[PDB]
Design a protein around this ligand. Structure first.
Ligand SMILES: [Mg+2]
Length: 100
């Protein structure tokens, strides 16, 4: 693969966390990507948590966010969780999506 850009809504997988609805984010000093020689690309993302958490995620552990209604987001789907933080985040993400 994909080509990510600030403002893209994505599911992101971090070790120790469910798939998280996130916003690709330009860090105002360190940029959008970590592109070190030999390493895999990481993307700076903003999680749709109660407040805007930011971190870096392996680009190959991102997938496009396509609404809470998408098959991948519902039960048995790739991205489904029942954790309360995820349900709140999908809501915010759907709002962010419906602008676009
Ligand atoms: Mg919290």
């Amino acid at each position: 693969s994909c080509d990510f850009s600030p403002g893209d809504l994505v599911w992101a997988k971090m070790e120790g966390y469910p798939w998280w609805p996130c916003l690709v984010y330009n860090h105002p000093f360190d940029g959008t990507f970590i592109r070190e020689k030999g390493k895999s690309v990481r993307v700076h993302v903003q999680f749709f948590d109660d407040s805007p958490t930011r971190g870096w995620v392996s680009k190959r552990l991102l997938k496009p966010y396509t609404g809470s209604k998408s098959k991948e987001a519902q039960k048995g789907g790739h991205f489904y969780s029942a954790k309360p933080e995820i349900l709140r985040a999908m809501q915010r993400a759907d709002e962010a999506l419906n602008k676009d």
